[PDB]
Design a protein around this ligand. Structure first.
Ligand SMILES: Cc1nc2sc3c(c2c(=O)[nH]1)CCC3
Length: 188
């Protein structure tokens, strides 16, 4: 279930200049070793279904952003199979899951705290399609999606950010809200 393939994106492939250019806006001091495309049909189809629903509701809003997420090597196969979906006890009592964080700029995700260097010094950051939708600033203490309207408090925001008009990060909460399209492997 949610089987996947991994294909190297070569420097000569159409999308390389764009993916590398975005990473290099803030990470040009690192050296890129490989960029790969993650091809997971079930995960892609489910993400696209969520995108279609959001596009049909949010008017002019550009619901998708491409953001970064650094992780340790041991999490890579999990992300490739499951994306950023989470399962745990009591998830189904409430309308959302535990937040998953993404950065606007690659250098944030390139921190060793996130993209932990592996045994060979290799660091791993995904360039992820994320349905940011309609967002507000995150709660300071209760890390859940806030209500949009005190008169309708089960209607929740799609994501939260640190700063509504100058974001540096986004937090996603819902299933199939993100697709791990590209994996960038790099070194100091
Ligand atoms: C595992 C992981 N956690 C976090 S928290 C956070 C980011 C980030 C990441 O890239 N990976 C980037 C923005 C704030």
């Amino acid at each position: 279930q949610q089987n996947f393939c991994v294909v190297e994106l070569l420097p000569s492939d159409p999308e390389y200049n764009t993916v590398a250019s975005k990473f290099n806006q803030t990470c040009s001091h690192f050296r890129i070793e490989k960029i790969e495309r993650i091809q997971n049909p079930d995960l892609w189809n489910s993400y696209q279904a969520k995108k279609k629903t959001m596009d049909a509701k949010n008017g002019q809003t550009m619901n998708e952003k491409q953001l970064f997420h650094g992780t340790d090597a041991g999490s890579v196969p999990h992300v490739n199979r499951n994306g950023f979906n989470r399962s745990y006890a009591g998830k189904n009592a409430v309308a959302y899951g535990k937040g998953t964080y993404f950065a606007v700029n690659a250098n944030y995700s390139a921190n060793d705290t996130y993209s932990r260097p592996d045994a060979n010094g290799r660091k791993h950051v995904y360039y992820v399609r994320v349905l940011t939708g309609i967002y507000t600033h995150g709660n300071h203490s209760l890390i859940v999606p806030p209500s949009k309207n005190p008169q309708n408090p089960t209607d929740l925001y799609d994501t939260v950010t640190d700063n509504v008009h100058h974001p540096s990060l986004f937090v996603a909460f819902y299933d199939y809200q993100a697709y791990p399209e590209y994996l960038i492997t790099f070194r100091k």
